[PDB]
Amino acid sequence: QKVLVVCMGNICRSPTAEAVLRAKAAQLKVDVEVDSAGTIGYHQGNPPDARSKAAGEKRGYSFSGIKARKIRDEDFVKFDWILAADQENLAELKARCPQSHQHKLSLMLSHSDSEYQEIPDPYYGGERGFELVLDLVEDAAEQFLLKL
Amino acid sequence: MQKVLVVCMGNICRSPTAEAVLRAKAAQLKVDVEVDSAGTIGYHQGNPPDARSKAAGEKRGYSFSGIKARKIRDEDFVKFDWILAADQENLAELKARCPQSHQHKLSLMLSHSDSEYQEIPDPYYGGERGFELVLDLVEDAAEQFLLKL
């Protein structure tokens, strides 16, 4: 089984989700491959945001092997789950994904019993927003991996 | 006499509208300015303006011919006298890439209008009202930016 998390730039939200899912999958002994991508390629080839990386490493998560990339047509066929950070991400995915694979698309937090439906973009904000992404992702990752 | 560059994120909705409106206003006001637009990202590179933006603007007699999306370049910070950003995130993005010596050129487009608005909201994921709003704010801000000289 393979899971792809998608945000806009693939530098803050989806890399954090991928790091947490990877670490929790290993702890929970769930054999799943995880990856992430963005809807845009502005950050193509970049490591995760240094604040995102620092904040995650604070909780023990490794961001090794994560570099920003744009989503490919081949992603919709390759992955079994494609999880969007927010509704704009999901709209982009819905537009690009073949009809046959539309069933694979969902908001990441649709798999979390949380007052949040979307993961807010921490990029232009302070430290609170980076801690928020982690809080949301840890909970969603725990509940989602349980469902798998 | 002056060169103005308007910048939004994708250069398909907001800054193309600002460009079309500023060009028309400049002509009627006989103020000798050259206008251009660009985006902070190149996702839409080479694309004409959003078909909804184009439709809405033509509703009011504006044309979008000759406008194709393009990413902001290091060269733009030297060339232009006025660089106007659609919203705060665009401006912050510009301030990060702009050289120290040209930071004086960067501002929000609506900060030149007596408007109660400071940012031009992105209409891309919204309905018709967002497109009419972009035009309303762009027309007000364009008129006041050109008058105020």
Side-chain angles (χ1 to χ4, degrees), chain B residues 86-100:
Chain B
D87 69 35
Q88 273 284 14
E89 293 180 356
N90 310 145
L91 179 61
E93 201 62 26
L94 293 174
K95 286 188 170 180
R97 189 193 179 113
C98 186
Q100 159 61 228

PDB file of all heavy atoms in Angstrom, chain B residues 86-100:
ATOM      1  N   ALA B  86      -0.423  42.568  -5.192  1.00  0.00           N
ATOM      2  CA  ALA B  86      -1.860  42.386  -4.982  1.00  0.00           C
ATOM      3  C   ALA B  86      -2.200  42.218  -3.503  1.00  0.00           C
ATOM      4  O   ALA B  86      -3.147  42.832  -3.011  1.00  0.00           O
ATOM      5  CB  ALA B  86      -2.378  41.200  -5.783  1.00  0.00           C
ATOM      6  N   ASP B  87      -1.433  41.388  -2.797  1.00  0.00           N
ATOM      7  CA  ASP B  87      -1.678  41.163  -1.368  1.00  0.00           C
ATOM      8  C   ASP B  87      -0.384  41.106  -0.546  1.00  0.00           C
ATOM      9  O   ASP B  87       0.711  41.242  -1.093  1.00  0.00           O
ATOM     10  CB  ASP B  87      -2.557  39.915  -1.156  1.00  0.00           C
ATOM     11  CG  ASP B  87      -1.854  38.612  -1.509  1.00  0.00           C
ATOM     12  OD1 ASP B  87      -0.631  38.486  -1.295  1.00  0.00           O
ATOM     13  OD2 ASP B  87      -2.551  37.689  -1.981  1.00  0.00           O
ATOM     14  N   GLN B  88      -0.526  40.921   0.765  1.00  0.00           N
ATOM     15  CA  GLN B  88       0.612  40.954   1.693  1.00  0.00           C
ATOM     16  C   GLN B  88       1.636  39.854   1.454  1.00  0.00           C
ATOM     17  O   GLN B  88       2.838  40.079   1.600  1.00  0.00           O
ATOM     18  CB  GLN B  88       0.135  40.868   3.147  1.00  0.00           C
ATOM     19  CG  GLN B  88      -0.211  42.209   3.770  1.00  0.00           C
ATOM     20  CD  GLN B  88       1.022  43.013   4.161  1.00  0.00           C
ATOM     21  OE1 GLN B  88       2.139  42.696   3.752  1.00  0.00           O
ATOM     22  NE2 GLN B  88       0.826  44.055   4.960  1.00  0.00           N
ATOM     23  N   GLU B  89       1.154  38.664   1.112  1.00  0.00           N
ATOM     24  CA  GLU B  89       2.037  37.530   0.865  1.00  0.00           C
ATOM     25  C   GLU B  89       2.861  37.755  -0.397  1.00  0.00           C
ATOM     26  O   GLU B  89       4.047  37.427  -0.427  1.00  0.00           O
ATOM     27  CB  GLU B  89       1.241  36.228   0.777  1.00  0.00           C
ATOM     28  CG  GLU B  89       0.603  35.839   2.101  1.00  0.00           C
ATOM     29  CD  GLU B  89      -0.199  34.554   2.031  1.00  0.00           C
ATOM     30  OE1 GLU B  89      -0.331  33.977   0.935  1.00  0.00           O
ATOM     31  OE2 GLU B  89      -0.707  34.119   3.082  1.00  0.00           O
ATOM     32  N   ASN B  90       2.242  38.325  -1.429  1.00  0.00           N
ATOM     33  CA  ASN B  90       2.976  38.682  -2.646  1.00  0.00           C
ATOM     34  C   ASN B  90       4.062  39.704  -2.338  1.00  0.00           C
ATOM     35  O   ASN B  90       5.197  39.570  -2.791  1.00  0.00           O
ATOM     36  CB  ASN B  90       2.050  39.245  -3.732  1.00  0.00           C
ATOM     37  CG  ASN B  90       0.823  38.382  -3.987  1.00  0.00           C
ATOM     38  OD1 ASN B  90      -0.255  38.906  -4.269  1.00  0.00           O
ATOM     39  ND2 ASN B  90       0.971  37.064  -3.886  1.00  0.00           N
ATOM     40  N   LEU B  91       3.706  40.720  -1.556  1.00  0.00           N
ATOM     41  CA  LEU B  91       4.642  41.782  -1.190  1.00  0.00           C
ATOM     42  C   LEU B  91       5.815  41.228  -0.384  1.00  0.00           C
ATOM     43  O   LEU B  91       6.967  41.586  -0.628  1.00  0.00           O
ATOM     44  CB  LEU B  91       3.926  42.873  -0.386  1.00  0.00           C
ATOM     45  CG  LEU B  91       4.774  44.057   0.099  1.00  0.00           C
ATOM     46  CD1 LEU B  91       5.391  44.825  -1.063  1.00  0.00           C
ATOM     47  CD2 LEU B  91       3.942  44.992   0.962  1.00  0.00           C
ATOM     48  N   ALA B  92       5.509  40.361   0.576  1.00  0.00           N
ATOM     49  CA  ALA B  92       6.537  39.734   1.404  1.00  0.00           C
ATOM     50  C   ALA B  92       7.479  38.902   0.538  1.00  0.00           C
ATOM     51  O   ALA B  92       8.689  38.876   0.764  1.00  0.00           O
ATOM     52  CB  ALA B  92       5.899  38.867   2.475  1.00  0.00           C
ATOM     53  N   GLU B  93       6.908  38.229  -0.457  1.00  0.00           N
ATOM     54  CA  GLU B  93       7.684  37.435  -1.405  1.00  0.00           C
ATOM     55  C   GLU B  93       8.610  38.336  -2.223  1.00  0.00           C
ATOM     56  O   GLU B  93       9.778  38.010  -2.438  1.00  0.00           O
ATOM     57  CB  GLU B  93       6.745  36.644  -2.326  1.00  0.00           C
ATOM     58  CG  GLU B  93       7.373  35.435  -3.006  1.00  0.00           C
ATOM     59  CD  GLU B  93       7.863  34.379  -2.029  1.00  0.00           C
ATOM     60  OE1 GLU B  93       7.322  34.289  -0.906  1.00  0.00           O
ATOM     61  OE2 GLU B  93       8.790  33.623  -2.390  1.00  0.00           O
ATOM     62  N   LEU B  94       8.082  39.477  -2.664  1.00  0.00           N
ATOM     63  CA  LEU B  94       8.869  40.463  -3.404  1.00  0.00           C
ATOM     64  C   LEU B  94       9.996  41.056  -2.563  1.00  0.00           C
ATOM     65  O   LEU B  94      11.113  41.228  -3.053  1.00  0.00           O
ATOM     66  CB  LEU B  94       7.971  41.594  -3.913  1.00  0.00           C
ATOM     67  CG  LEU B  94       6.950  41.219  -4.987  1.00  0.00           C
ATOM     68  CD1 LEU B  94       6.037  42.400  -5.275  1.00  0.00           C
ATOM     69  CD2 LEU B  94       7.645  40.745  -6.255  1.00  0.00           C
ATOM     70  N   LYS B  95       9.702  41.363  -1.302  1.00  0.00           N
ATOM     71  CA  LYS B  95      10.700  41.947  -0.400  1.00  0.00           C
ATOM     72  C   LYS B  95      11.854  40.981  -0.125  1.00  0.00           C
ATOM     73  O   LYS B  95      12.972  41.410   0.154  1.00  0.00           O
ATOM     74  CB  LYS B  95      10.055  42.402   0.916  1.00  0.00           C
ATOM     75  CG  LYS B  95       9.223  43.670   0.780  1.00  0.00           C
ATOM     76  CD  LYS B  95       8.759  44.198   2.127  1.00  0.00           C
ATOM     77  CE  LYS B  95       8.141  45.581   1.988  1.00  0.00           C
ATOM     78  NZ  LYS B  95       7.674  46.135   3.288  1.00  0.00           N
ATOM     79  N   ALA B  96      11.580  39.682  -0.216  1.00  0.00           N
ATOM     80  CA  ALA B  96      12.605  38.664   0.011  1.00  0.00           C
ATOM     81  C   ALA B  96      13.578  38.549  -1.164  1.00  0.00           C
ATOM     82  O   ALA B  96      14.762  38.272  -0.965  1.00  0.00           O
ATOM     83  CB  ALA B  96      11.957  37.316   0.294  1.00  0.00           C
ATOM     84  N   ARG B  97      13.078  38.768  -2.378  1.00  0.00           N
ATOM     85  CA  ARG B  97      13.887  38.620  -3.592  1.00  0.00           C
ATOM     86  C   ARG B  97      14.468  39.946  -4.093  1.00  0.00           C
ATOM     87  O   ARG B  97      15.479  39.959  -4.797  1.00  0.00           O
ATOM     88  CB  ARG B  97      13.054  37.974  -4.701  1.00  0.00           C
ATOM     89  CG  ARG B  97      13.850  37.580  -5.936  1.00  0.00           C
ATOM     90  CD  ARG B  97      12.935  37.240  -7.096  1.00  0.00           C
ATOM     91  NE  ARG B  97      13.688  36.872  -8.295  1.00  0.00           N
ATOM     92  CZ  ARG B  97      13.706  35.658  -8.845  1.00  0.00           C
ATOM     93  NH1 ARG B  97      13.001  34.658  -8.324  1.00  0.00           N
ATOM     94  NH2 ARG B  97      14.432  35.440  -9.936  1.00  0.00           N
ATOM     95  N   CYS B  98      13.826  41.053  -3.732  1.00  0.00           N
ATOM     96  CA  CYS B  98      14.265  42.375  -4.168  1.00  0.00           C
ATOM     97  C   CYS B  98      15.624  42.729  -3.560  1.00  0.00           C
ATOM     98  O   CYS B  98      15.877  42.415  -2.400  1.00  0.00           O
ATOM     99  CB  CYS B  98      13.227  43.423  -3.770  1.00  0.00           C
ATOM    100  SG  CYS B  98      13.548  45.087  -4.392  1.00  0.00           S
ATOM    101  N   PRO B  99      16.512  43.366  -4.348  1.00  0.00           N
ATOM    102  CA  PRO B  99      17.756  43.887  -3.781  1.00  0.00           C
ATOM    103  C   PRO B  99      17.495  45.004  -2.780  1.00  0.00           C
ATOM    104  O   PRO B  99      16.486  45.702  -2.883  1.00  0.00           O
ATOM    105  CB  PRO B  99      18.500  44.442  -5.000  1.00  0.00           C
ATOM    106  CG  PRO B  99      17.929  43.713  -6.162  1.00  0.00           C
ATOM    107  CD  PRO B  99      16.488  43.488  -5.816  1.00  0.00           C
ATOM    108  N   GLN B 100      18.404  45.164  -1.825  1.00  0.00           N
ATOM    109  CA  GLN B 100      18.304  46.216  -0.814  1.00  0.00           C
ATOM    110  C   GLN B 100      18.042  47.592  -1.434  1.00  0.00           C
ATOM    111  O   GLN B 100      17.204  48.353  -0.945  1.00  0.00           O
ATOM    112  CB  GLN B 100      19.591  46.251   0.021  1.00  0.00           C
ATOM    113  CG  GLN B 100      19.855  47.561   0.751  1.00  0.00           C
ATOM    114  CD  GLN B 100      18.777  47.916   1.755  1.00  0.00           C
ATOM    115  OE1 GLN B 100      18.289  49.045   1.774  1.00  0.00           O
ATOM    116  NE2 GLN B 100      18.403  46.956   2.596  1.00  0.00           N
TER     117      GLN B 100
END
